[PDB]
């Protein structure tokens, strides 16, 4: 009765898409020249980790990059000189996500423990110590990126997300729309809206001001592993276990182009766009990463060399280089 | 040549590398295990045999030293029924101690399905599973009472026969022996269906009043380490 009505609405939404789906992105964008064959070479090999690396994030200066190892270590590597700057040991060994604050003064991390603990990097004494613990979730922290020097969003495995204040450490805005465990999130350039993917083959947009689900996107056949906004902020790519990446536009409210290949039957673990967005770097479980054409779906490059599953992939703010971290306990930077 | 800041940076990197190798020493010296099981499996009692923080905490660690070897057992706490995501985080643990209550014929199918899923998992294919058939006294009492038949849930039990490889304990009814060996073979068949020699199962008959569990865990971890060192060289 409220379940039948609901499905009716679905049809309506679907019908709306049928009114906006005039042509396909591959059709309208066919005359442009191809990107060619981008051959990215390895320039830096950061070694020293003990256990499998699980996450990383570049800094605003494009110099320091944080990486998390489930042995309980957050290492901040200087990508230029490869010199280890900070090595923070974690109380909880199982860490699954890390984030570098935009100001470069704090670094957040989380994992199986329901706490996205933050550590200060610019203490008056020069050492690192526990600054604040954001506890309260009933699931493992999938990702908690920094929105500002005071507010921080955190996605948990309890099918909900929460916005905390570093000062007080209390939930300021709660999001309980997702039905499955939230696996990844991606903020917008203006930090006003952010998309989040869950294990229900559905992505959801959320406004940090109001805190309500304004748009919901579907199309995937399995759990969405990675999600990353588009450099312009109007679209976002999502990679799931179905060995297929899908680009969804917020203004069109429908998938534009699909990235997949018969030879690829493995799930996606990482996704990232270049400074221009023409190239989409997606990490797969086949020990390699693929550089697809956002406007042509053509695989331009195959970054190989890793001996284990790719865990994280991060492009610099200036689109200069991309750092890929796998379970082999080594990171590789391609430029 | 280099700048004055480069010297300090290199010294800091050297100190951090020294700290990292010092930590790796202990990391390789200590072993890690993953405890799994249902609510009735009695994980609390086995965890309470550790003889050597937050309410919503999702992981509990227990460190115990046996024969000068440290073992850290990790058990998920506040977590939902879905486990296909975070379980992949334990694709490098030493062993997985899976508990089952052998006396509960109702949920025995659920335990078998969970064991099959954990065995056939893509990321857990290279990890051994230590099966502790806890609560043997309850199983013996239920078998001696005869109020619940096993063929109601597993018809093959009607055709099962006590294997000569068995080791009956002194003063044990043959019925209890055959029942426990059947519920052990139920898991061993699934284990061997996709073993491939890369991982094996270690079944043991344990109960609530049992202190040798630590010795069994130590011996199983030692055997797993021996097998790993053998496969590393290819002698395997």
């Amino acid at each position: 009765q409220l379940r039948q009505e609901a499905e009716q609405l679905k049809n309506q939404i679907r019908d709306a898409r049928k009114a906006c789906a005039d042509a396909t992105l591959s059709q309208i964008t066919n005359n442009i020249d191809p990107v060619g064959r981008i051959q990215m070479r390895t320039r830096r090999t950061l070694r020293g980790h003990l256990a499998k690396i699980y996450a990383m994030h570049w800094g605003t200066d494009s110099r320091l990059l944080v990486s998390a190892s489930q042995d309980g270590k957050l290492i901040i590597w200087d990508s230029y000189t490869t010199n280890k700057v900070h090595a923070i040991p974690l109380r909880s060994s199982w860490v699954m996500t890390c984030a570098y604050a935009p100001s470069g003064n704090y670094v957040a991390c989380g994992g199986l423990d329901n706490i996205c603990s933050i550590y200060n990097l610019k203490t008056r004494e020069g050492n690192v110590r526990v600054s604040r613990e954001l506890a309260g979730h009933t699931g493992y922290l999938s990702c908690c990126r920094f929105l500002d020097d005071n507010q921080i969003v955190t996605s948990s495995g309890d099918t909900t997300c929460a916005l905390w204040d570093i000062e007080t450490g209390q939930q300021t805005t709660t999001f309980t729309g997702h039905t499955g465990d939230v696996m990844s999130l991606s903020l917008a350039p203006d930090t006003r809206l952010f998309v989040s993917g869950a294990c229900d083959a559905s992505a959801k947009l959320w406004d940090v001001r109001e805190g309500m689900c304004r748009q919901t996107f579907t199309g995937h056949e399995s759990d969405i592993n990675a999600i990353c906004f588009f450099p312009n902020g109007n679209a976002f790519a999502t990679g799931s276990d179905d060995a297929t990446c899908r680009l969804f536009d917020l203004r069109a409210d429908q998938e534009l182009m699909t990235y997949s290949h018969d030879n690829i039957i493995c799930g996606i673990t990482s996704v990232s766009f270049s400074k221009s967005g023409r190239l989409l770097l997606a990490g797969y479980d086949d020990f390699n990463c693929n550089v697809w054409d956002a406007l042509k779906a053509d695989r331009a490059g195959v970054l190989a060399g890793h001996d284990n599953r790719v865990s994280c992939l991060g492009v610099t703010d200036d689109g200069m280089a991309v750092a890929t971290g796998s379970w082999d306990s080594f990171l590789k930077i391609w430029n | 040549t280099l700048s004055a800041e480069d010297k300090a940076a290199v010294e800091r990197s050297k100190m951090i590398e020294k700290q990292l190798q010092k930590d790796k020493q202990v990391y390789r010296a200590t072993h890690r295990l993953l405890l799994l099981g249902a609510d009735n499996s009695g994980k609390s009692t086995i965890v309470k045999q550790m003889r050597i923080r937050v309410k919503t905490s999702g992981i509990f660690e227990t460190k115990f030293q046996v024969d000068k070897v440290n073992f850290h057992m990790f058990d998920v706490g506040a977590q939902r029924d879905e486990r296909r995501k975070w379980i992949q985080c334990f694709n490098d643990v030493t062993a997985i101690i899976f508990v089952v209550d052998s006396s509960d014929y109702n949920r025995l199918q659920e335990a078998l399905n969970d064991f099959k899923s954990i065995w056939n998992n893509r990321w857990l294919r290279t990890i051994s599973v230590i099966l502790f058939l806890n609560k043997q006294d309850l199983l013996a009492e239920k078998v001696l009472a005869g109020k619940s038949k096993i063929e109601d849930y597993f018809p093959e039990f009607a055709r099962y026969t006590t294997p000569e490889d068995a080791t009956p304990e002194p003063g044990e009814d043959p019925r209890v022996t055959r029942a426990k060996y059947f519920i052990r073979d139920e898991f061993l068949r699934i284990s061997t269906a996709s073993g491939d020699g890369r991982h094996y199962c270690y079944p043991h008959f344990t109960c609530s009043v049992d202190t040798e569990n630590a010795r069994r865990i130590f011996n199983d971890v030692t055997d797993i380490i021996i097998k790993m060192n053998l496969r590393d060289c290819g002698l395997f």
Partner: nanobody
Amino acid sequence: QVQLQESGGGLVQPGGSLRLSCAASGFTFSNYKMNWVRQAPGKGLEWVSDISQSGASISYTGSVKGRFTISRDNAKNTLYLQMNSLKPEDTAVYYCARCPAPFTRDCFDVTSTTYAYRGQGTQVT
């Protein structure tokens, strides 16, 4: 979107038979491992049977092993389940679950209370 609609459930006396049919949409039914579970009044999700992609590998729970037959139809992307020798214990809501990832033998969370890749099920009594 992923959708699984089950049909064929109804009232039947002991010893009868029922042909449950589940129609799937939103994914390649031929590249996913399927399972049939059941939940009875008061009890939890109980696994009934399981079938692979092509159908060569099939498994049934010992409680119903010998009277249930599961099958797939890729030409129509349908899951059929023929149940015979029904008994009062079979009164329950039957659901159909799909494996989380394709080309995987393991099927986790199939018996989980919350599972997105699962239909509404049909009540049999």
